Amino acid sequence: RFSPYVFNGGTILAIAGEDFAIVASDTRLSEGFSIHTRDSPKCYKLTDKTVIGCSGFHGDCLTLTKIIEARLKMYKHSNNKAMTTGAIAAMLSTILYSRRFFPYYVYNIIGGLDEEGKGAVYSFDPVGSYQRDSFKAGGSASAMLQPLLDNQVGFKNMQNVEHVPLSLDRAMRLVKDVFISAAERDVYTGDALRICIVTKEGIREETVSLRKD
Amino acid sequence: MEYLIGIQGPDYVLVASDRVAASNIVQMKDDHDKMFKMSEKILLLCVGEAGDTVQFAEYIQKNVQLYKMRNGYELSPTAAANFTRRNLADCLRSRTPYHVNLLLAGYDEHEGPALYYMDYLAALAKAPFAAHGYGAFLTLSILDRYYTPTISRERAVELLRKCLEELQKRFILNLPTFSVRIIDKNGIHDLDNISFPKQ
Amino acid sequence: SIMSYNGGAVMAMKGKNCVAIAADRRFGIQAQMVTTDFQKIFPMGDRLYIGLAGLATDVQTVAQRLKFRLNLYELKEGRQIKPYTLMSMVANLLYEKRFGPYYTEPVIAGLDPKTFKPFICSLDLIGCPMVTDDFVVSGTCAEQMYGMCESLWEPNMDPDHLFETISQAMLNAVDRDAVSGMGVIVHIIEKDKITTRTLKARMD
Amino acid sequence: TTTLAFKFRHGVIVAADSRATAGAYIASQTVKKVIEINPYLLGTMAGGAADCSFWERLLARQCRIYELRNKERISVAAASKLLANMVYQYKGMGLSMGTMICGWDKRGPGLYYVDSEGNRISGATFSVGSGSVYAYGVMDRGYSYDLEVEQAYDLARRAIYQATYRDAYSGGAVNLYHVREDGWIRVSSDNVADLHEKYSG
Amino acid sequence: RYDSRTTIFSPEGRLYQVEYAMEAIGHAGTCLGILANDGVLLAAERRNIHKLLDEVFFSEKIYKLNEDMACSVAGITSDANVLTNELRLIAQRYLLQYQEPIPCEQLVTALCDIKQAYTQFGGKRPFGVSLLYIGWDKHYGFQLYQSDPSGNYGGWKATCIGNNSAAAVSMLKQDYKEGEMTLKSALALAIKVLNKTMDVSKLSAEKVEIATLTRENGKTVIRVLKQKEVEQLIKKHEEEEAKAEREK
Amino acid sequence: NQYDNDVTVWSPQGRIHQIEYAMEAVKQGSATVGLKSKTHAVLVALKRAQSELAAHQKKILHVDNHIGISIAGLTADARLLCNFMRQECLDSRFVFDRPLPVSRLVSLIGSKTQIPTQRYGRRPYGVGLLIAGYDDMGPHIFQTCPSANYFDCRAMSIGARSQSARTYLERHMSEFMECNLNELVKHGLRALRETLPAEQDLTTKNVSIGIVGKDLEFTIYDDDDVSPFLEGLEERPQ
Amino acid sequence: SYDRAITVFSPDGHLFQVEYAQEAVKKGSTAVGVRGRDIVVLGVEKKSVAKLQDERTVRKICALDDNVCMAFAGLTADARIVINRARVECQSHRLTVEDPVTVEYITRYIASLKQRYTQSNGRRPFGISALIVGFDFDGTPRLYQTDPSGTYHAWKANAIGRGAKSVREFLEKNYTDEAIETDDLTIKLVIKALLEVVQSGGKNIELAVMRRDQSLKILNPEEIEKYVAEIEKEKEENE
Amino acid sequence: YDRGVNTFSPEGRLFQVEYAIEAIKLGSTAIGIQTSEGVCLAVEKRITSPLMEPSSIEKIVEIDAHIGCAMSGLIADAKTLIDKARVETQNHWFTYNETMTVESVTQAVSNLALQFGEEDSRPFGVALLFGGVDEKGPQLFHMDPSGTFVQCDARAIGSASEGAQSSLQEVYHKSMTLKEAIKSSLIILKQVMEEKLNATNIELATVQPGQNFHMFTKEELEEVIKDI
């Protein structure tokens, strides 16, 4: 009989900097044991200071993206201003709970700048609970990225090591190293790496190739 | 699971319940009350599900008080008992069935004292004594042994104490304390609490 | 089953100029009794009774809904109700719950309001009327009640022997049943008076 | 998941862990399981993340309107009752909620317990969670109504530590709040690994 | 003017449509109930007693309603049949709910809330019907009540109808009894009051109606007493006139 | 005079007076002028003060990234049509993922305003909408009316004493197709200064200018950015 | 000229059909009420029994809940709907929120129910005014009042009915800033206030008090006759 | 044609809503002034009786903990507008974790006042003054029964409205302070009311950026009046 859900894969990474935010994802879209395309990024520029990532079931990712982009315009003409980073995370929690008994199969991470100019990363669940974190990794390779970033960013289980804040250039090579190691052991990850950098001067993009198998 | 008792006298109604609000292993509350003063001569005992006990019995509680304020006088215990049966049976073949077990205790100025039994399928009865829960099995044949239709209110408390010591002996649950009421021509009087030094 | 949740037995029997009806007294859950004074025969006007058996919820429910419609009928019309008319009234009430049905099987017994003519009938749980000339039975212990009435019934019987026949039919059949008993009440009515007797039965 | 709450002479003590998992996978270690409803009310999170997050935020939406319409704060028994009726309409549909309500009232302290099943009870001591049953015994061995303020801080901090030791679904940090007559106050937030060097030493 | 619908006040509190309905009942029949210990009674008048009718019901003004209550009627007959079928349907809804008869006051207020509700809602009419109440209950015994088109009511011990027979209320006070209120003492008072108000002399039995309600062995029988015993009740009062002229 | 009461009632001359009266509500509002080139469509409005120190009431309001409208008439019917206007613009973005063609959006307005001009129970919308936009075939200048007619045009002025603005537009409409924004804007606001009494001048605090372009999103300039537009002007020949 | 509608305005901004509803209040019997230290009291006048009816069905003083009272004016039909509706709300409040009902909450329900009942055409407004007296909200005595426009409002001493202007002017020169303690003194203030009745028969006063802890205490015409005697005892000092 | 909200004139405009503007005129006066230090606000009570309890007459209500209010005209329609204005600020915080701006409060309020005959009743009879300090600093706004919404720097409405405006335009300038604007406001009040100005005829309400509390003055008001 008909089943309404299917898994598509994907891996989303976000790191809250001191005055920046980095959002990274792969561009591989798959289903079962087939590859649909090798060019399908998960980054979405909502505003000039907020980028969202959407993994999971791809049909709900296309729907939920267009609902949020409609409500950005509905906020603005009612208030003569744009939404903040924390306002979007409060709005998204009500949208995800609004279909509590038929849930979206989407994992969400919002990264961007606050009103003070600092980094902010909000992680989500498919029902709508959230919290502010410093770094999260969502998607199929989520278990292969969280223990390594605890060592490098959080400095957990380390002795006699000072807590220097992560610079921008050091954070770029940490993102480029974790996706090489994750594409080796995971099958839902590869073919590119789209990286979005959110600073006070706009949004930069950068693409790094991976292995194509 | 929890226990009720319904000893009826010639001019009094002796009722008692337990004080346990357990959660599946633990005992969260040991002074819980299951006694609802519907009016100045009618009590209410309720045993059932988690939310269905509080939601339904307070719906009856705040509907008999409406009859008192609007008509100036008080319901009889028979008419109050036969209104509670109407609300289960009407709300039984629906999406929200209430799963509670009740017994009603009332005194009338013209009919004397009265006791009514209630199933979770809304079946009325007029009993000289009644009980509920798993402890209803072990205790009612004791109460069937020594009952007399002309019994004093002092022997009924002694018969109630005989009825609860065997529930202390051969029943697996703990049940340490038991609150006791009494209803007469003067109203609802609160008797002393019943506890058990086991060994 | 759902019918076997509380038990019950209702019997009616036609005589010469009179008619009798009897039922049990036991109220109880599946194996545990509660009381021995549960009413299962309800007067609906003079010289005309009704008996109910089945689920104890629908016994008390239908007997109040039928009383709701009877009093509205006997005020729009100054006359009383005919026994054929009540059978059509009950069959309408059960068929409205075609797919949500009440779990009872009514038995109607009574005399004609003008003549002395008796009337007995029984219905199903969805309202199939069935009139007879000798007896109707309903309840859980139905098969035991057919065995007693097919052998003891006589066509033209005085109220003396009609009482003695329905007494031996109820006592010997309900004592074979397990979930029915604890006392038997018998109503025997006629043109002049109504006689109600209770029998000495086994209380086990 | 392990929360507890107990009231005494000087108000109410609230304590909880900070670990939220997903199957056998730990999601985070910094989950704030005590939801700050008002400056005079506190709520907990026990069973279901978004279920305890949404309906207590909806309760905080309701208590503010009650303050504006009546020029007076809401009572503790009122807010626990309003939460019980909202969840009861979704009975059987599959909610999970086992929160607690704390706060000072005109009658004094206040402590109620609300389930998703429909249980609304008062009391003096409570402990909710998967590792809740490990916390009842160590609390009741040291509980008294006439405990000191610094003594009550060490009792709840001990009881969360013994619960996170035996349970696998409990760990992270130990939050600790204190409800005073005027309003609640944040006491501290200590790591479990820091307490292990303190308690075992 | 202000003779529009009933949902508009006059310049000063004088709902004119309600006042027009409360004056319409004076040009109608005549009904009265009297005091009684251990009983109560009603008395009515047969209008248009032309010799080509049947009277197959033999009860026209009086409608037995629950089991121990009846009522008179006065006003527009089109609205009369609506209220009686509604009022009987109230008492059986109460009886289905509590399995006890309706205690004779909150039956009246149940109708009076319906009769009021047509004075506030729409462009229609109020009920142009006033009517009486007799009954017995557990709490107060024998009772009398008086309906109005506005939904107002009130208990009484003896009352009647207005512009037809408003002079009878002066007679009920002048010949008032209190305590000595047996049924035979009240039936003699009833035929005397209907003698003057019904302007047709000598009081033929086919123009009147008498209904009683007693309390017998806990059954509360209701009597609509037949025309044969009206005859010996009238001729008793005709004899008392010939006895009263001995003082002259 | 008995025919002058409802929208339903026809006249013995064949003219419904209630539609004829809603035209008069348009003349109560202030003047506003819209025009276009081959590449750029600019509409310029005129603010009106309420008191000596309250803020001036705004006229031009953003709708979409390629559509902006002006206003003249009732403010009650203004925001009621705006909420209908914004809902239709984002439905094509949500369904078709394209911006609306401007010519077919206005046909939805004439279907919207037709029902309350025929059925009893709702007055006609007293409103004077000027519409500028960009479909795939260049700029457009549209006007509407409470008689539910919509007129495509290359220049239009409606509102109080706007006849003198129309005379300036007719003798300069040959110059509008070629000139760019540095004078196309101040071709337009030379038409507003004849809709003024001859003693006061168009200042920086009482005028709004909205520009939507072929490569330019619709942008509203007011009270600070009007000064690069009001520079380089002559006075009135007095 | 133009009234005949509750939705139209006057050329000087009035609602005459709302203002005509207050004219129907002035045909009612007067009822006064004061608050005191602990005991609140309210009394009514103009009983006027008519020799042939029972007087327990003409009652003007009712209780909504266990610790709140009610006195009204206007016409008797519209009061019965408002009383019967307010008994439901002061009971359904207790079911949804487990507190007892404050005296302030029930007056906002009566005013708001009379509010929306004025707005829509074809709905004749209530021609009654009410006095809500209750020392319920945590030992604090209060009394409010209503209006046919739907404006709940708080006084400290009140008079309504046919002749309220004389009594309200009387109480301003009589209600001392000295709080009337020894609550029979406060009851004697009402009997002195109700002494300016339309006829002042003496036996036409039905005073009802409440000691803020018990239920309603309807006074008998023997205790009230004793308070009428001591009012004449203080009147002997004029000579 | 002057008794219907569904009927135009040969000239233009209602009369119906024009008659609703006239209902404001028989109210009480109220003055609000916007200043860079915050927004002060004053009103006149017109207490009728000494037995009449004074704090049951509201003219300043608290919409939110950084937004005040003022009213005139019909009291019955005012309590309807205050109700949703408290709810719409509360629904916005529920779904955005932020405070609704003072301008966008009245956007929600004006969306229902223009619904009197525009559904599928009568217009309201009350003007409102909204003062508050949002992220754009202190603000002061004004509305009407016709839904026409505008920002004002210093506004006086109610009875004595036009007579206050002429004197109020004289002394206002941009570089005011808050304590200067408070004593400047009630010089106007004692010139436009008929009773002698004391501590019981008026009441004040202020709002500051760092002092979002205290939209009321409690007897401090006696200090301001004694130094007039």
Side-chain angles (χ1 to χ4, degrees), chain E residues 106-122:
Chain E
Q106 57 183 356
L107 181 65
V108 178
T109 69
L111 186 68
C112 290
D113 292 332
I114 298 170
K115 292 175 71 178
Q116 176 181 356
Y118 286 174
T119 60
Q120 296 92 17
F121 273 54

Side-chain angles (χ1 to χ4, degrees), chain H residues 85 98 133 215:
Chain H
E98 67 183 2
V133 178
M215 282 69 73

